[PDB]
PDB file of C-alpha atoms in Angstrom:
ATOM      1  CA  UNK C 451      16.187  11.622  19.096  1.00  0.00           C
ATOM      2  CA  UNK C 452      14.805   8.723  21.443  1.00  0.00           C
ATOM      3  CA  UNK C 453      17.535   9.596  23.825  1.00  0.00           C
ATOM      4  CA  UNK C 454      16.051  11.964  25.582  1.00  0.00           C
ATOM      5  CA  UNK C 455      12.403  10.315  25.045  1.00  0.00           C
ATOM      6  CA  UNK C 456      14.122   7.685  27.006  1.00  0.00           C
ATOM      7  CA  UNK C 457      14.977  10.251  29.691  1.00  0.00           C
ATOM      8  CA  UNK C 458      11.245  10.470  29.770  1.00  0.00           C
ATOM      9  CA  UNK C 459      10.005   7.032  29.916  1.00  0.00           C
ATOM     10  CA  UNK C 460      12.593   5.845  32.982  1.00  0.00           C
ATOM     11  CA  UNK C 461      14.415   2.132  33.533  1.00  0.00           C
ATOM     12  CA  UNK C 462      11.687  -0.178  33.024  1.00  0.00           C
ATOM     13  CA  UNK C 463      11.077   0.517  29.459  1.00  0.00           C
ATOM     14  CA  UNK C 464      15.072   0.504  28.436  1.00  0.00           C
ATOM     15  CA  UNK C 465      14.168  -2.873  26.443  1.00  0.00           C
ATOM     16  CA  UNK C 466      11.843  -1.465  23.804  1.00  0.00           C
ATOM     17  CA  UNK C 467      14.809   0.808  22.560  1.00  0.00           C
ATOM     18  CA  UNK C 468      17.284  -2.343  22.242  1.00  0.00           C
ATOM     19  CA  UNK C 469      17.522  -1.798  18.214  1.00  0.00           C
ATOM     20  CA  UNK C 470      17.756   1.450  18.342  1.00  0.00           C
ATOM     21  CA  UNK C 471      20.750   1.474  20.669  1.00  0.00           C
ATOM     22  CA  UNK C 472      22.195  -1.501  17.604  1.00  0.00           C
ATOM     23  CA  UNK C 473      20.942   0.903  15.417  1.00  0.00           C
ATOM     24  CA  UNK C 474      23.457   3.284  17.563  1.00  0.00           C
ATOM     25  CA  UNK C 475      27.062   1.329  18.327  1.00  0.00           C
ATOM     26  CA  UNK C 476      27.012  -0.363  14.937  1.00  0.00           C
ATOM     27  CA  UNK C 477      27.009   3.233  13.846  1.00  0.00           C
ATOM     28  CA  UNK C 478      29.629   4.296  15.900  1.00  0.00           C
ATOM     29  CA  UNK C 479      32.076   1.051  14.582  1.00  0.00           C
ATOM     30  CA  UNK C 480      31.054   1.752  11.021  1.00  0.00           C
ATOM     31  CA  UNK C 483      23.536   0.513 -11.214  1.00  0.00           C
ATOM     32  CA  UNK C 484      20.104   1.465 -11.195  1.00  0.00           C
ATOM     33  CA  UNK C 485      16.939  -0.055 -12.638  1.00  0.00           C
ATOM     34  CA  UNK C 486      13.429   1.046 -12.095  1.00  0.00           C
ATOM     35  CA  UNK C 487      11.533  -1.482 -10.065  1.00  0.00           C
ATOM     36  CA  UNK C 488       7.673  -1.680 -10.094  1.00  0.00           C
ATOM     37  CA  UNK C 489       6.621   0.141 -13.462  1.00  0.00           C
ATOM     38  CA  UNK C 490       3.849  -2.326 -13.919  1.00  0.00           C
ATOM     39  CA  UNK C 491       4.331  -3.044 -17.287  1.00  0.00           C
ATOM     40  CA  UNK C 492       3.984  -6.510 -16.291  1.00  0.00           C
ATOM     41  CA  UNK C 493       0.699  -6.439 -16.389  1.00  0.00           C
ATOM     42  CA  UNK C 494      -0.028  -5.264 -19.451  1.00  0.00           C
ATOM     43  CA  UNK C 495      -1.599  -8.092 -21.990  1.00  0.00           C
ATOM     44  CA  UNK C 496      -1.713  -8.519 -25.602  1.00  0.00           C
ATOM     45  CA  UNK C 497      -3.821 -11.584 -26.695  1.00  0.00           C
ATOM     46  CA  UNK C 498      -3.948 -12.663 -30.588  1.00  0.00           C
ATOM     47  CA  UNK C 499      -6.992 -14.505 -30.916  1.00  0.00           C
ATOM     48  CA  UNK C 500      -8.919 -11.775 -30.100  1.00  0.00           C
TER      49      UNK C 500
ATOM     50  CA  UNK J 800       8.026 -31.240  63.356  1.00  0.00           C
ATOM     51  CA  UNK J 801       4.616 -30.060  64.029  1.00  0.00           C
ATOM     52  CA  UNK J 802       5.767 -25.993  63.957  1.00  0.00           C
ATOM     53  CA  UNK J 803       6.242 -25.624  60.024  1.00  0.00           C
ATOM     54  CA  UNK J 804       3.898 -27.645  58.573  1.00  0.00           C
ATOM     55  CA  UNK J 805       0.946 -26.324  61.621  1.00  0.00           C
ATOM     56  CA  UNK J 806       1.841 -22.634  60.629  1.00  0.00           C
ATOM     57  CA  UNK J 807       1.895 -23.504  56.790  1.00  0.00           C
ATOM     58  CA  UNK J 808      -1.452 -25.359  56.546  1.00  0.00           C
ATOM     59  CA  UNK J 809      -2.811 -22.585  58.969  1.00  0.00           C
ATOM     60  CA  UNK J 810      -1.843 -19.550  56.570  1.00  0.00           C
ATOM     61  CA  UNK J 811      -2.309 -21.162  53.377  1.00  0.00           C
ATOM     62  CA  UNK J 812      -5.781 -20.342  52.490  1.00  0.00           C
ATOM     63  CA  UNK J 813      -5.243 -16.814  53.688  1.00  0.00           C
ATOM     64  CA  UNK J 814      -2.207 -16.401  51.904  1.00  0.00           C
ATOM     65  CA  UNK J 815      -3.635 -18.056  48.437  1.00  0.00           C
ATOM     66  CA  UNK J 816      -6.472 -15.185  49.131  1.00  0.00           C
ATOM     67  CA  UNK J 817      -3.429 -12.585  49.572  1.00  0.00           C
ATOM     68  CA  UNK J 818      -1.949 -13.405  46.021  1.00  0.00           C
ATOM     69  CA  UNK J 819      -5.376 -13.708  44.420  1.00  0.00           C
ATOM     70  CA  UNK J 820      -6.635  -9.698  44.425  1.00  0.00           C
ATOM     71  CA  UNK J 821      -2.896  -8.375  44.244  1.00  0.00           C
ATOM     72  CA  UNK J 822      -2.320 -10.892  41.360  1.00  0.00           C
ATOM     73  CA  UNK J 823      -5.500  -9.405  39.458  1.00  0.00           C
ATOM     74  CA  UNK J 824      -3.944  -5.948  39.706  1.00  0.00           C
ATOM     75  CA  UNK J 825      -0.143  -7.001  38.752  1.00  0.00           C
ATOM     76  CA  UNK J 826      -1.518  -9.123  35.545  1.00  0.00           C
ATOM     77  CA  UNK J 827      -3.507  -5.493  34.657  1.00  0.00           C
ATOM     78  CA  UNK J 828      -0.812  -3.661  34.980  1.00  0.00           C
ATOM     79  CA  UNK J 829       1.220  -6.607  32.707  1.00  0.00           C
ATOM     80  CA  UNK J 830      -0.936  -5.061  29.836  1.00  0.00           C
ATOM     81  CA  UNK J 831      -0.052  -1.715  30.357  1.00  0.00           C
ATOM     82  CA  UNK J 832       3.077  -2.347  30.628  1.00  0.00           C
ATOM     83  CA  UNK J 833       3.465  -4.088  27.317  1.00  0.00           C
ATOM     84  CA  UNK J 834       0.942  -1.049  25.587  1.00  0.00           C
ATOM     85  CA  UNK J 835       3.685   1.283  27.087  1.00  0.00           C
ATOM     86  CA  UNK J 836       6.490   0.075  24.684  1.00  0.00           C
ATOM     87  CA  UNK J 837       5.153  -2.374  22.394  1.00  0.00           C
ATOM     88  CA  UNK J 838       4.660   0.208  19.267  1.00  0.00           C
ATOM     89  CA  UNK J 839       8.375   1.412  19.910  1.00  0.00           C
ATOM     90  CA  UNK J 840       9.489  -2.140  20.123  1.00  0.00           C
ATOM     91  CA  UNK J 841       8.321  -3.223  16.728  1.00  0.00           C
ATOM     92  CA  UNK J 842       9.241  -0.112  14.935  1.00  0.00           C
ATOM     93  CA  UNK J 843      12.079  -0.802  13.394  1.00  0.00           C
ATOM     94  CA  UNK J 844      10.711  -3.812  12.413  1.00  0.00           C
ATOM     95  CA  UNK J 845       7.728  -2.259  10.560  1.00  0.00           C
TER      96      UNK J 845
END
């Protein structure tokens, strides 16, 4: 979609798009855990 | 020998005055320029 955003902004600004247009060729030449449950912070303390 | 350096020395100050003003608006613009793209430059990488 920044194509034709592009088409909007003109020559000067062709840098700013540079890894989009890697983003681009690449594309044309080309078990599950759960993460972050937080029950690391749970606690459990004898001496209480 | 005297032509270059009588000229140079002659138009110098002027000159230096020339590429004072338009130099304050250029370096403005420089800002714009980088506020026109900057947010699409880094937004892949963020």
């Amino acid at each position: 979609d920044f194509i034709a955003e592009a088409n909007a902004k003109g020559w000067i600004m062709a840098g700013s798009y540079f890894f989009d247009l890697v983003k681009l060729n690449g594309s044309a030449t080309e078990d599950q855990f759960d993460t972050g449950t937080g029950l690391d912070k749970s606690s459990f303390d004898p001496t209480q | 020998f005297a032509i270059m350096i009588l000229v140079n020395v002659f138009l110098r100050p002027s000159l230096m005055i020339i590429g004072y003003i338009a130099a304050i608006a250029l370096s403005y613009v420089g800002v714009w320029i980088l506020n026109a793209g900057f947010d699409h430059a880094i937004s892949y990488i963020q």
